[PDB]
Amino acid sequence: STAGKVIKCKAAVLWEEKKPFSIEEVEVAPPKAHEVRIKMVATGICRSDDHVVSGTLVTPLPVIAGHEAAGIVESIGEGVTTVRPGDKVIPLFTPQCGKCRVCKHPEGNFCLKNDLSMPRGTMQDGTSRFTCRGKPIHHFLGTSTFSQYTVVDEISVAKIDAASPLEKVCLIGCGFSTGYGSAVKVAKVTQGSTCAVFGLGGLGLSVIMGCKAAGAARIIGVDINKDKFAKAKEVGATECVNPQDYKKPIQEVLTEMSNGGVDFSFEVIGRLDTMVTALSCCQEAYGVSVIVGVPPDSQNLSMNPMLLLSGRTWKGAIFGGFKSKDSVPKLVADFMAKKFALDPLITHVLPFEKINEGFDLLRSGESIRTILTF
Amino acid sequence: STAGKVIKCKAAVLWEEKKPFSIEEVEVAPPKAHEVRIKMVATGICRSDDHVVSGTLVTPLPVIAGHEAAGIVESIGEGVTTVRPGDKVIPLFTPQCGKCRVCKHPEGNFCLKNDLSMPRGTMQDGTSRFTCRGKPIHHFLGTSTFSQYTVVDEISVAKIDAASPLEKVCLIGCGFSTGYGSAVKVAKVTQGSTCAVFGLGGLGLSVIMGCKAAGAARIIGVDINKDKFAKAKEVGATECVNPQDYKKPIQEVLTEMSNGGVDFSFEVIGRLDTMVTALSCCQEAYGVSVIVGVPPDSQNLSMNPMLLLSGRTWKGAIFGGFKSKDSVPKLVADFMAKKFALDPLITHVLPFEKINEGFDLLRSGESIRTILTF
Ligand SMILES: NC(=O)C1=CN([C@@H]2O[C@H](COP(=O)(O)OP(=O)(O)OC[C@H]3O[C@@H](n4cnc5c(N)ncnc54)[C@H](O)[C@@H]3O)[C@@H](O)[C@H]2O)C=CC1
Ligand SMILES: NC(=O)C1=CN([C@@H]2O[C@H](COP(=O)(O)OP(=O)(O)OC[C@H]3O[C@@H](n4cnc5c(N)ncnc54)[C@H](O)[C@@H]3O)[C@@H](O)[C@H]2O)C=CC1
Ligand SMILES: O=CNC1CCCCC1
Ligand SMILES: O=CNC1CCCCC1
Ligand SMILES: [Zn+2]
Ligand SMILES: [Zn+2]
Ligand SMILES: [Zn+2]
Ligand SMILES: [Zn+2]
């Protein structure tokens, strides 16, 4: 009863920074050519969504945020070939156009069609499909999953197993895949190695899962919230340290614990100081450090380049280095074949209408992932 | 007639920063256990030696500098098994102890016995073999090659082909191997790729040599001294750019020329600003940037970590990543088999007594490598 028509539905609109989401009626236009309209089933609350509220991540407002989700195709636009109505899908916050220089490179995944580097808050054609109170509303990362219905470009959606449990596999749309791939694909953690993981939220626990899958012998979790240590050890950490417990800088502590530096370190918080600390605690001649966390907008870090001249490697990645449309369906299939677990990341399940309580749980330190159900 | 005795010889002593070297008589003690005393034959002038004079590279003074050299063993201490009197040798400014975690690692080369990180200016045992005017003089990087005779630890010397031309292969002790390896071993430049090389001195020309050996399709040399361009093209650069010729920042020119960023970039100067520029000019999702230049002591750079989050890899290396004692004899063998050329790097030859003129040539921009003969 909705194909080709405007849909009126519920969404969580962010009208301005540092305010609660406003749960109210929006209008969702039908998909144009090469676009897909999706009925949302589940969406996770990721720290990157909170970064929009806090001003840490700048994107045009007002906006419908949300990017870690799964749903069912309601209708498709002219020329769509990769999904059909009724299909289960995961929106892709990093597109895979398949035709740019990055998509064609064996090691690149940050497709040049992304809306992250110079955010416009639109669809690929530069316009918006959302209206609220008569006003146009921006999209977020080409996904906008905090809504009962969204419209995405075809290059930003992947079809997944029809038997998938959507309230779990939405995490493959961001948190799991990003952390897991940061360990197994970006860092390329080796068997028998020592790893250090800064930040033990949903992303950091997924990094730990990847370090353990890669055969690391030691995995040191680092967090200022000791309530995060129990779950980190359940998913593979061999020990946890709270920097606030020590009188010396944690890079010195980790270098001593590791008899000279760790093999792999990961910054999974989003602080400039912990990015430099994580680089410093990896072994000076052969260590590798990977930045996953998102730093505050337009702020530079300061570091001594001798940390690199001795032999260290420093890198970062979006979405765990995974080519999004190729990888998301394979990752769902791996989950269905029991190759990794997602339940350890899920601490809370709430109806979508309680989105603000879900953010309060994240901000208070009490949750890993809250999954919102529509 | 000198074994077991103190040798009185000439050396170039640096008594204080920013002053000419003083060519005068020194006393060189005989080698203790596991040490080797070498009659020097030829030594190159590298910018790192000038960094000692300028205070850019801090090591205790007074000092006998020099680290790029080749000579003949005069005598060996007790227990030495890897060289004999009469052998041709190259001193190793990065040792290879064979026993530390770095030496045992498949990719590491910055041996933990190095005298770079926390410089003492001594032999491994914490003492010096040099006296001048009755005063003890420091060593430099365990090599101290600006002297007619030096004493090195066994882990800091490699035996080379007895037919080697010492006035050429001294460059394998530093400039050639560092630049060549930075391309072929550290960056792992790929066939058909586009490279940018910042700084076209002895080290940068050697990077170009490695990029060409690796099969790069384009190699863009970058230097503010346009007189360096002709030789850079002779050894493989396909084009050269002078940043002072442009109204836009050079990362912008290079991104434009490479249709979105280069595959590999190399900083081979030693400036904080060009380290950040070189990182920025490599492609944001899959580019690799290698720091080779030495930054000024204790200074930090400032950079936006979003340059890394998009997917860039940033690394540095000492000595082109080569394990020194294993690699130097193989590199000499390759030179003897005509696998690479050293003559393009040698622009001037002077007697050792004219060392100060050789440094004047480097500082004026006129030379690539001056080789000093003893
Ligand atoms: N590179 C990518 O593609 C993606 C990046 N991100 C970013 O990853 C980061 C982590 O996201 P989540 O796991 O969802 O966040 P989270 O808020 O659930 O976890 C962050 C953890 O960092 C801890 N922490 C905070 N300050 C700390 C400090 N000084 N020292 C040690 N620990 C500290 C917190 O206690 C918390 O447990 C965020 O910046 C997020 O924006 C998220 C997903 C995709
Ligand atoms: N990582 C390692 O193991 C080693 C590092 N080094 C360092 O490599 C660097 C290069 O050494 P050399 O080739 O012997 O020095 P060099 O002085 O012969 O060459 C440096 C080049 O950089 C150019 N240059 C200077 N400022 C520039 C600027 N703003 N922009 C563009 N070009 C600029 C100069 O005109 C010159 O041609 C030095 O810092 C040296 O200390 C040297 C050997 C071993
Ligand atoms: O969490 C999902 N995406 C993130 C990727 C890193 C930049 C901010 C958005
Ligand atoms: O040029 C030779 N060695 C250099 C290596 C980089 C640090 C300073 C000394
Ligand atoms: Zn693309
Ligand atoms: Zn996310
Ligand atoms: Zn040198
Ligand atoms: Zn060693």
| Residue A288 resides in a domain | yes
Residues 6+ apart with CB under 8 A from B354: B372
Are the beta carbons of B291 and B199 closer than 8 angstroms? Answer: no
Instruction: Return left, alpha or beta for B188; rule: phi > 0 is left, psi -120 to 50 is alpha, else beta.
Output: left
Task: Give the Å distances, CA to CA, from A225 to A221, A243, A253, A366.
Answer: 11, 10, 18, 10
3-class state of residue A10 by DSSP? strand
Give the residue, by CA position, lying nearest to ligand 4 atom 2.
Answer: B48
The one-letter code for the residue type at A322 is F
Give the CATH number of the domain where residue A146 resides: 3.90.180.10
Query: How many helices (DSSP H) and strands (DSSP E) are in chain B?
Result: 11, 19
Give how far A135 is from chain B: nearest CA, Å: 32
Give the residue, by CA position, lying nearest to ligand 4 atom 7.
Answer: B294
- What is B151-201 written as a DSSP string? EEEGGGEEE--TT--HHHHGGGGTHHHHHHHIIIIII---TT-EEEEE--S
Residues 6+ apart with CB under 8 A from A364: none
Q: Which H or E element spans position B28?
A: strand B22-28
Are the beta carbons of A151 and A129 closer than 8 angstroms? Answer: yes
| Residue B158 resides in a domain | yes
CA distance B47 to B363: 9
The percent of chain B in helix, strand and coil, each rounded to the nearest 5, is: 30, 25, 45
Residue of A nearest to B283 (CA): A102
Q: Tell me, letter by letter, the H, E, C secondary structure of B54-105.
A: HCCCCCCCCEECCCCEEEEEEEECCCCCCCCCCCEEEECCCCCCCCCHHHHC
Are the beta carbons of B23 and B46 closer than 8 angstroms? Answer: no
Neighbours of B345 (CB within 10 A): 23
CA distance B303 to B310: 14
| Residue B166 resides in a domain | yes
Q: Tell me, letter by letter, the H, E, C secondary structure of B218-284.
A: EEEEECCCHHHHHHHHHCCCCEEECHHHCCCCHHHHHHHHCCCCECEEEECCCCHHHHHHHHHHECC
3-class state of residue B30 by DSSP? coil
How many independent structural domains does chain B possess?
Answer: 2
Q: What is the DSSP letter of A12?
A: E
Torsion angle of C-alpha atoms A59, A60, A65, A67, degrees rounded to 10 = -50
| Residue B353 resides in a domain | yes
Helices B250-257 and B272-281 meet at what angle, rounded to 10? Answer: 20
| Residue B49 resides in a domain | yes
Are the beta carbons of A229 and A254 closer than 8 angstroms? Answer: no
- Which tokens belong to A295? 């730093």
Residues 6+ apart with CB under 8 A from A165: none
Q: Which residues pair with A24 in a beta bridge?
A: A11
Are the beta carbons of A235 and A209 closer than 8 angstroms? Answer: yes
E strands along chain A, which residues? 7-13, 22-28, 35-44, 69-76, 88-91, 130-132, 135-137, 149-153, 157-159, 194-198, 218-222, 239-241, 264-267, 288-291, 301-303, 313-316, 346-351, 369-373
Same domain assignment for residues A115 and A214: no
B105-141 CB burial, b ≥16 within 10 A, e <16 = beebbbbbbbbbeebebbbbeeebbbbbeeeebbbbb
Q: What is the DSSP letter of B147?
A: B
Residue B364 known to be catalytic: no
Of A205, A187, A192, the closest CA to residue A343 belongs to A205
Are the beta carbons of B153 and B147 closer than 8 angstroms? Answer: no
Going from the Cα of B3 to the center of ligand 1, the distance in angstroms, rounded, reads 64
Residue B174 known to be catalytic: yes
Of B218, B168, B194, B163, the closest CA to residue B344 belongs to B168
The one-letter code for the residue type at A226 is K
CA distance A213 to A225: 25
Quick one: how far is CA A112 from the chain centroid? 18
* B102 C-beta closer than 6 A to ligand 4: no
| Residue A135 resides in a domain | yes
Of B65, B25, B24, the closest CA to residue B45 belongs to B65
CA distance A144 to A130: 10
Same domain assignment for residues B149 and B244: no
Are the beta carbons of B307 and B279 closer than 8 angstroms? Answer: yes
How far the first Cα of chain B sits from its last, in Å, is: 20
The percent of chain A in helix, strand and coil, each rounded to the nearest 5, is: 30, 25, 45
Quick one: how far is CA B272 from the chain centroid? 19
CA distance B204 to B175: 9
- What is A307-348 written as a DSSP string? HHHTT-EEEE-SGGG--HHHHHHHHHHHHHTTSS--GGGEEE
Same domain assignment for residues A234 and A282: yes
Same domain assignment for residues A163 and A182: no
CA distance B237 to B226: 13
Same domain assignment for residues B142 and B233: no
The catalytic position among B103, B170, B174, B281 is: B174
Residue B48 known to be catalytic: yes
Torsion angle of C-alpha atoms B91, B93, B96, B99, degrees rounded to 10 = 130
Same domain assignment for residues B168 and B210: no
Same domain assignment for residues A302 and A350: no
Q: Which residues pair with B349 in a beta bridge?
A: B371
3-class state of residue B327 by DSSP? helix
Q: Are strands B239-241 and B218-222 parallel, antiparallel or unpaired?
A: parallel
The one-letter code for the residue type at A222 is V
- Which tokens belong to B356? 């100060």
Task: Give the Å distances, CA to CA, from B332 to B72, B151, B159, B163.
Answer: 15, 22, 10, 10
| Residue A198 resides in a domain | yes
Going from the Cα of B229 to the center of ligand 2, the distance in angstroms, rounded, reads 14
Residue of B nearest to A272 (CA): B305
- Which tokens belong to B290? 């290698």
Between A260, A306, A308, which is nearest B315 by CB? A308
Are the beta carbons of B173 and B91 closer than 8 angstroms? Answer: yes
Ligand 3 atom, smallest distance to A49 CA: 1
Going from the Cα of A95 to the center of ligand 1, the distance in angstroms, rounded, reads 23
Quick one: how far is CA B243 from the chain centroid? 25
Same domain assignment for residues B193 and B136: no
Look at B316 and A321 and tell me if their CB atoms are within 8 Å. no
CA distance B111 to B95: 6
- Which tokens belong to A145? 């999953």
The one-letter code for the residue type at B19 is K
Same domain assignment for residues B169 and B183: no
Tell me if the bond preceding A62 is cis, omega within 30° of 0.
Answer: yes
Residue of A nearest to B275 (CA): A305
CA distance B71 to B58: 26
- Could you tell me if B232 lies within 8 Å of chain A, comparing CB atoms? no
Of A194, A216, A209, the closest CA to residue A287 belongs to A194
Q: Which H or E element spans position B314?
A: strand B313-316
- Which tokens belong to A346? 């899920």
Q: Which residue has the tokens 């000692």?
A: B52
Are the beta carbons of A30 and A149 closer than 8 angstroms? Answer: no
- Total residues belonging to chain A: 374
The one-letter code for the residue type at B100 is C
Q: Using a CB-CB distance cutoff of 8 angstroms, which residues of chain A are in contact with residue B310?
A: 110, 117, 316, 318
3-class state of residue A372 by DSSP? strand
CA distance B200 to B215: 19
- Could you tell me if B110 lies within 8 Å of chain A, comparing CB atoms? yes
Q: What are phi and psi of B76, to 5 degrees?
A: -130, 150
Torsion angle of C-alpha atoms B220, B226, B232, B233, degrees rounded to 10 = 80
The one-letter code for the residue type at B229 is F
A291-329 CB burial, b ≥16 within 10 A, e <16 = bbbbbeeeeebebbbbbbbbbbbbbbbbbbbbbbbebbb
Task: Give the Å distances, CA to CA, from A302 to A58, A307, B56, B326.
Answer: 22, 12, 19, 36
Task: Give the Å distances, CA to CA, from A128 to A28, A67, A138, A139, A151.
Answer: 9, 16, 6, 7, 9
Give how far A174 is from chain B: nearest CA, Å: 15
The residue range of the domain holding A111 is 7-173+342-373
Between A110, A275, A308, which is nearest B310 by CB? A110
Look at B314 and A309 and tell me if their CB atoms are within 8 Å. no
Computed from CA positions of residues A253, A257, A258, A259, in that sequence, does the dihedral angle turn out positive or negative? Answer: positive
Residues 6+ apart with CB under 8 A from A256: none
Residue B195 known to be catalytic: no
Residues with CB under 5 A from ligand 8 (ion): B 97, 100, 103, 111
Are the beta carbons of A332 and A161 closer than 8 angstroms? Answer: yes
Quick one: how far is CA B278 from the chain centroid? 20
- Residue among B56, B203, B254, B368 to mutate when testing ligand 2 (max atoms within 8 A of CB): B203
Quick one: how far is CA A117 from the chain centroid? 16
- Total residues belonging to chain B: 374
| Residue B115 resides in a domain | yes
Of A265, A314, A299, A356, the closest CA to residue A65 belongs to A356
Same domain assignment for residues A245 and A160: no
Q: Which residue has the tokens 């790192």?
A: B48
Expressed in Å, this structure's resolution amounts to 1.5
Give contacts of A 73-102 with B, CB under 8 A.
Answer: 101-102
Q: Are strands B63-64 and B35-44 parallel, antiparallel or unpaired?
A: unpaired
Residues 6+ apart with CB under 8 A from B43: B66, B68, B69, B70, B145, B146, B170, B352, B371, B372, B374
Same domain assignment for residues B41 and B148: yes
Q: Using a CB-CB distance cutoff of 8 angstroms, which residues of chain B are in contact with residue A284?
A: 110, 117
Same domain assignment for residues B254 and B359: no
Ligand 1 atom, smallest distance to A48 CA: 41
| CA of B316, nearest ligand number | 2
Neighbours of A226 (CB within 10 A): 13
Rounded (5°) CA angle B214-B220-B225: 125
Are the beta carbons of B73 and B87 closer than 8 angstroms? Answer: yes
CA distance A20 to A355: 9
Rounded (5°) CA angle B84-B85-B91: 75
The one-letter code for the residue type at B211 is C
Q: Which residue has the tokens 């063998």?
A: B333
3-class state of residue B37 by DSSP? strand
Give the CATH number of the domain where residue A209 resides: 3.40.50.720
CA distance A69 to A7: 19
Q: What are phi and psi of A249, to 5 degrees?
A: -60, 145
- Could you tell me if B314 lies within 8 Å of chain A, comparing CB atoms? yes
Give how far B321 is from chain A: nearest CA, Å: 8
CA distance A42 to A372: 6
Are the beta carbons of B353 and B23 closer than 8 angstroms? Answer: yes
How far the first Cα of chain A sits from its last, in Å, is: 19
CA distance B73 to B39: 6
* A203 C-beta closer than 6 A to ligand 1: yes
